[PDB]
Design a protein around this ligand. Sequence first.
Ligand SMILES: [Cl-]
Lengths: 122, 123
Amino acid sequence: AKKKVLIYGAGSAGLQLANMLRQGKEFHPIAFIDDDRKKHKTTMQGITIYRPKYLERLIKKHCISTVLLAVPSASQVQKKVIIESLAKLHVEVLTIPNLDDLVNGKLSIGQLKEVSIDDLLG
Amino acid sequence: AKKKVLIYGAGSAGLQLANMLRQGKEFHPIAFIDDDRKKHKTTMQGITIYRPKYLERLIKKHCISTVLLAVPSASQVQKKVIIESLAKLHVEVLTIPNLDDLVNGKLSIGQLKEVSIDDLLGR
Ligand SMILES: [Cl-]
C-alpha cells in the first residue's frame, strides 16, 4: 500500500498536491492540517482538514511517518514554526517548491524535497 | 488605463492571477483581499493585502466595480459567503476555475467566469 501522509496546508497548493498524490503510486493523503480555523473539520479532496492541535493524534492513529509541507504563501516565520512543530513529533518532512518557483512555473507542486536548514531559517 | 480590480485570495492562486493580469492589458490589480488576518497589511509583489473589513473603503477609494475571486481552496459554503458579501457592495464578481480544473491544467487560472446569479443573490 502507498505510504500514508498528512499534508500540512489545505490552500490551493495542498489541495492540488493531494489530488496528484491520490492519482499516483507513492503516497496516500490521509488528512490535511491547516492553521485556518474556518477550515477545521471541513472536507476537501475527499478528506478531512484539521487545526494543528490534531497533529500528534493523527500521526499516532494512522502510524504516519511523513508529513508533506504545502504552505508556499506562509511567511518564513510561520513556516519555521511549522517545521519545528513537526520535528518534535519525529516525522520526516518533505516540502513542495518555494512560492516563486511555483508562480513563475519552473517547478511542479508535486516536486517534493526533504526540508533543510535553508528551509527553516530562510 | 486598465480596469481596476481587487483580487480576493492572496495565496499562490491569487498571486499567479495578479501576474496573469499585471502583464496583461485588461485589469489592474490594486490590492488583495484575504481572510487570513496574519496577512493583513503585508505586501506581495508591490501590492498590499487587506482583511475583508477593508472592502468598502478600497472599492470607494479606487472606484472599483469588479472583484476577482482566486480562492479555489475555499469550500463552496465559504465561497458563497464571500460572493454574497461582494454582491451587496454593488461590484461584479468573476472567478478563476475550480481547483480540480486547475490541477490537470485543463483550464487556465486566467479564465475568468461571471459567478452565477443564483450564487450572487443567494437564491
Ligand atoms: Cl485558494
